[PDB]
């Protein structure tokens, strides 16, 4: 009922990815997919 990257504004998606040593390349949805796809995969 909250999630994170789910749908931040392109400014936040770029902000977390910028600080994540990983930027977001693509449209707003691509940004959303980059954070969630990168977040779902990267996780011990």
Curated annotation (Swiss-Prot):
It comes from the Eukaryota. The modification Phosphoserine is found at residue 23. Residues 5-39 form the SAP domain. Present with 6580 molecules/cell in log phase SD medium. Facilitates RNA binding of SUB2 and likely plays a role in mRNA export. Suppressor of the transcriptional defect of HPR1 by overexpression. Belongs to the SAP domain-containing ribonucleoprotein family. Interacts with SUB2 in the presence of RNA; this interaction facilitates RNA binding of SUB2. This is Protein THO1.
């Amino acid at each position: 009922g909250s999630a994170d990257y789910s749908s931040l504004t392109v400014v936040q998606l770029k902000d977390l990815l910028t600080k994540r040593n990983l930027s977001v390349g693509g449209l707003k949805n691509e940004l959303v997919q980059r954070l969630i796809k990168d977040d779902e995969e990267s996780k011990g």
